[PDB]
Each structure stands twice: as structure tokens, then as C-alpha cells.
RNA sequence: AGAGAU
């Protein structure tokens, strides 16, 4: 309840800025901003960062795609460092 | 893996 930013790693570009956002905003409620840090050199190391409205949403995203084997790659969808511990 | 380039 204090974070909101997810980290997305290893995954075919099926997930792109708009699709990750569509998935995030509908499956997860509006992704405020999706950071595509890689993909500038080339489609290599496609990892991203996505921003969500509060966490129910972000926490939702990591739950939905983490551990997904897509095209032979296991997705590493994770949310920010948990600040809802205590 | 867990940091913002586009």
C-alpha cells in the first residue's frame, strides 16, 4: 500500500507498451506509466517497468503474469519492494 | 531481480 511500480523481465515482445498497459489497465486497472528502458539498442533485454494507480492493481499484475512460460521463456513479472509488511 | 531509457 506504499509502492505501485512493477518490474517486467524476460518475455517475448507480445507485451509492449500499449499491450502491457491494456493488460495492466483492464486486467489490472490503468498503468500510469510503462517504462521501456531497453529496446533502444534493439529488441534485446526487453525488460520494462510499469506504474500502476496504487497496488491492488500492481500486486494484481505480478500475480497474473509471473511464472509464465511464453515461447520458451519464463516471465519475471514482479512488483516493487513490499512496503505492506508492517 | 528489482531501475527510466524511449
Amino acid at each position: 500500500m506504499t509502492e505501485c511500480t512493477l518490474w517486467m523481465t524476460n518475455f517475448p515482445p507480445s507485451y509492449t507498451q500499449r499491450n502491457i498497459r491494456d493488460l495492466l489497465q483492464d486486467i489490472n486497472v490503468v498503468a500510469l506509466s510503462i517504462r521501456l528502458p531497453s529496446l533502444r539498442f534493439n529488441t534485446s533485454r526487453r525488460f520494462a517497468y510499469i506504474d500502476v494507480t496504487s497496488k491492488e492493481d500492481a500486486r494484481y499484475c505480478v500475480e497474473k503474469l509471473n511464472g509464465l512460460k511464453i515461447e520458451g521463456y519464463t516471465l519475471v513479472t514482479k512488483v516493487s519492494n513490499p512496503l505492506e509488511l508492517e
Side-chain angles (χ1 to χ4, degrees), chain A residues 13-81:
Chain A
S14 182
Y15 305 92
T16 162
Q17 13 164 334
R18 62 141 277 131
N19 290 333
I20 215 166
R21 197 225 52 229
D22 203 88
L23 154 130
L24 259 122
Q25 80 174 87
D26 174 83
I27 298 187
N28 311 310
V29 180
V30 288
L32 305 185
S33 294
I34 103 93
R35 334 284 173 193
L36 69 175
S38 280
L39 234 68
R40 98 271 290 241
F41 346 75
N42 186 37
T43 194
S44 330
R45 233 279 185 178
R46 346 186 195 261
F47 96 113
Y49 305 130
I50 323 100
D51 225 303
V52 220
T53 200
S54 294
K55 186 46 186 319
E56 269 52 68
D57 355 80
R59 201 191 295 114
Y60 208 7
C61 188
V62 39
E63 183 167 294
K64 294 268 179 172
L65 312 172
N66 96 98
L68 257 293
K69 293 92 187 173
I70 34 175
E71 294 181 46
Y73 314 96
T74 304
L75 238 174
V76 179
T77 322
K78 246 242 75 153
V79 69
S80 1
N81 198 73

